[model samples]
Target: SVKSEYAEAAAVGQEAVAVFNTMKAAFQNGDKEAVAQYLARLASLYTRHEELLNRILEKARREGNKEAVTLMNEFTATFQTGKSIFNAMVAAFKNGDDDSFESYLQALEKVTAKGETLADQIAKAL
Candidate 1:
């Protein structure tokens, strides 16, 4: 059950990315059901990861690690990304299309990379 839980999230996320790839190719020609199904699956990844991070943050806090504070904050940032991504979906769903989705994706893409670049630079300097 535990293994499946992670597996499902990972699988769903991949499905979502795959769905997006198809959408990019054929938003006009793509099947609506396929988009909905895949988008739903992909979205679960963001939420599940958020939940996973909660336990991680708690463990870090209990252990009194200074890094936990930073790590926990990243979860918040991730949520912001998810929130934006989800809301953009909602808006698109409502409008039957969201031209803003690209901008939101771009912003979120950068957000996810934020810590990686920062960490790399910090490590190099240290």
Candidate 2:
């Protein structure tokens, strides 16, 4: 069950990356509508990712899988950090603050890389 749950989470993670990439491109091209749409999708995906991690954490705890519990906790925190950066990015966009938006976007990319590495560690642990 943990394996299946993680598989689903990994799939969602990949989809999130794809959506983020599209959103970044839209922003670059100044396609406000497309960026807005993709941003909404990305937000939803992040929510889903959080939920999936919670599920995994619960199951891991139940099974006494200490490694998974630890990793999931770290992953959840990383996702939260990423989510905050994303929110900042949205606010910057709304206020037409290009500099702040760019800064947050760069920070978000670093968070994404960290999250992905954690996901890989989780997969191996499982």
Candidate 3:
């Protein structure tokens, strides 16, 4: 009965990691356009990932799987925050505001750290 949700989450997670790695490479290369392209993929993948995660989370809560709920909540927060910061980063980049762009980079670092940690927790719990 529970064959799919995890598989879908897992597949999406792997896909996201690949996109993120490419994005990181683009950033290091100072290829802003490439970064933008990879980020578009990353952002789109995230949207699909969120839908799958939400489905799993809803089922966990309904079943009273407290640990799953907590892990999913933490995961969701990181994903949500990461996406929001991503938007700001794009805006700063578009505006050519070095100051705000740098600020968003710092923010992204913070969120990335938190997201990695939460991601592990979610993975182990499930």
Best by TM-score: 2
Write down the RMSD of all candidates, one decimal each: 6.0, 1.3, 2.5
- TM accuracy, model 1: 0.59
The CA lDDT of each predicted structure is: 0.53, 0.86, 0.74
Candidate 3 has a TM-score of 0.78
Question: Candidate 3 — worst ten consecutive residues by lDDT sum?
Answer: 1-10
lDDT of 1: 0.53
lDDT tens readout by residue for model 1, 1-126: 123333343353444445556644444465665666655654675666556645555655666766544645554675456556765864675567546655655565555456344433433432
Pairs that collide in candidate 2 are none
Error of 2 at 102 (Å): 1.1
Tens digits of per-residue lDDT for model 3, 17-116: 6676677667767787887787688777778888888998898878888877777777788878877887887787778776886677678667766766
Clashes (N, CA, C under 3 Å) per candidate = 0, 0, 0
In candidate 2, how many Å is residue 120 off? 1.2
Residue-wise C-alpha lDDT for candidate 2, range 1-126, written one tens digit per residue: 489998998899889878887888888888887887987898888889888878988999999988788888888999889989998888888898879987888898889988988889888887
Order of quality (TM-score): 2, 3, 1
Q: How far is candidate 3 from the true structure (C-alpha RMSD, Å)?
A: 2.5
lDDT of 3 at 24: 65
Better of 1 and 3 by TM-score: 3
